[PDB]
Amino acid sequence: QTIKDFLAVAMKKWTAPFEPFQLIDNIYYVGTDGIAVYVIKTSQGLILMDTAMPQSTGMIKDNIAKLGFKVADIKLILNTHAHLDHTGGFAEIKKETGAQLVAGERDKPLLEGGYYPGDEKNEDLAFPAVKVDRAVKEGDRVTLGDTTLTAHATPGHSPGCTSWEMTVKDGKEDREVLFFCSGTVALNRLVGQPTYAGIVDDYRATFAKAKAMKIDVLLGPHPEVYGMQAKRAEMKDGAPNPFIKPGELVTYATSLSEDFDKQLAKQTAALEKK
């Protein structure tokens, strides 16, 4: 991986438009073609799940309005993890709306500083700093009106990476949704000068945890996590909701664990003096 390539991709597919849509029950997709953002409609206002790159905040606000929502009705902002491709609009939206920001406790310093962990002087990974109103840990519950989400600590990709669980209806039946936080290696350093202390252990705890969770609908902060576009194509009035795939988090976490092993080996070999 190169940071140049990360930025190149980040300034292309990550900023390209995608038509917003009702995904399941009160969960609506309002992200880009490469970064997933969601509105959760409650009886007491909107919950915003993540934002996108700093340059894309206007696009996200536009997508919200395209669905008939008001940006002003956002009361809570939740974060999966504190990297600029997910936090770029937090300061702006929080100021505009007066919403409270909720995030994993170990990501609080990242959010409040607007920097990438272990690469804190890199301005192309910086974002506008934002205050955290509530810092969460494993099992904490966050409620707006009729809707409650449960925090799960799934560190590795960031130290405070938080996967959020909530129940939706599919017809008469409950289905459990996870907004998985990310388990990719991406720009992180695993060995040598690791991005943060204990990162390797965190990733492997997270892959195992993910495989053991009872989840009907896998979501995530990039559409690639759950094959969003292919599922959207299969949506049809009266047909089963294609986002319900209860074995998918096991399959996806297995693919992540296998890639993790590859990247750990690669970085370990790269540390050898040549």
**Part of the chain binding Zn ion (CB under 5 A), chosen from 12-20, 85-93, 229-237, 254-262:** 85-93
CB of 187 to Zn ion, least distance (A): 8
SS3 227: coil
For Zn ion, the closer CB: 150 or 267: 150
Q: Is 266 annotated as a binding residue?
A: no
- CA distance readout (Å), 255 to 28, 155, 157, 259, 260: 27, 17, 15, 6, 9
Give the separation between CA 11 and CA 52, rounded to whole angstroms.
11
d(CA 73, CA 48): 10
> What b-and-e string marks burial along 161-198, b requiring 16 or more CB atoms within 10 Å of the CB?
bbbbbbebeeeeeebebbbbbbbbbebbbbbeeebbee
Instruction: Tell me how many residues contact Zn ion (CB under 5 A).
Output: 3
> Smallest Cα–Cα separation from 83: which of 163, 9, 187?
187
User: Residue 202, interface with Zn ion (CB under 5 A)?
Assistant: no
Stretch that binds Zn ion, among 51-59, 83-91, 123-131, 173-181 (CB under 5 A): 83-91
Chain centre distance of CA 120: 21
The single residue listed with the structure tokens 């600590």 is 153
Q: Which stretch binds Zn ion (CB under 5 A): 25-33, 71-79, 147-155, 260-268?
A: 147-155
Residue 86 in marked binding region: yes
State the nearest-atom distance from the C-beta of 222 to Zn ion, in Å: 6
Q: Is 258 annotated as a binding residue?
A: no
Q: Which stretch binds Zn ion (CB under 5 A): 50-58, 75-83, 100-108, 258-266?
A: 75-83
**Interface pick for Zn ion out of 61, 83, 94, 175 (rule CB under 5 A):** 83
**Residue 172 in marked binding region:** no
138 is an annotated ligand-binding site residue: yes
Q: How far is CA 177 from CA 83, 144, 147, in A?
A: 22, 17, 13
3-state class of 90 per DSSP? helix
* Rounded least distance, CB 248 to Zn ion, Å: 18
Distance in angstroms (rounded) separating the CA atoms of residues 154 and 210: 8
CB of 81 to Zn ion, least distance (A): 5
CA distances, 161 to each of 89, 136, 152 (Å): 18, 10, 9
Q: Judge whether 96 is annotated as a binding position.
A: yes
Q: Which is nearer to Zn ion, 85 or 248 (CB)?
A: 85
Among 18, 29, 41, 85, binds Zn ion (CB under 5 A): 85
The interface region with Zn ion, picked from 55-63, 77-85, 94-102, 245-253 by CB under 5 A, is 77-85
Among 152, 215, 220, 249, the residue binding Zn ion under the rule CB under 5 A is 152
Asked whether the beta carbons of 194 and 185 are under 8 A apart, the reply is no
Residues flagged as binding site = 61, 81, 83, 85-86, 92, 96, 138, 152, 157, 209, 222
Chain residues that interact with Zn ion, rule: CB under 5 A: 83, 85, 152
Residues flagged as binding site for Zn(2+) = 61, 81, 83, 85-86, 92, 96, 138, 152, 157, 209, 222
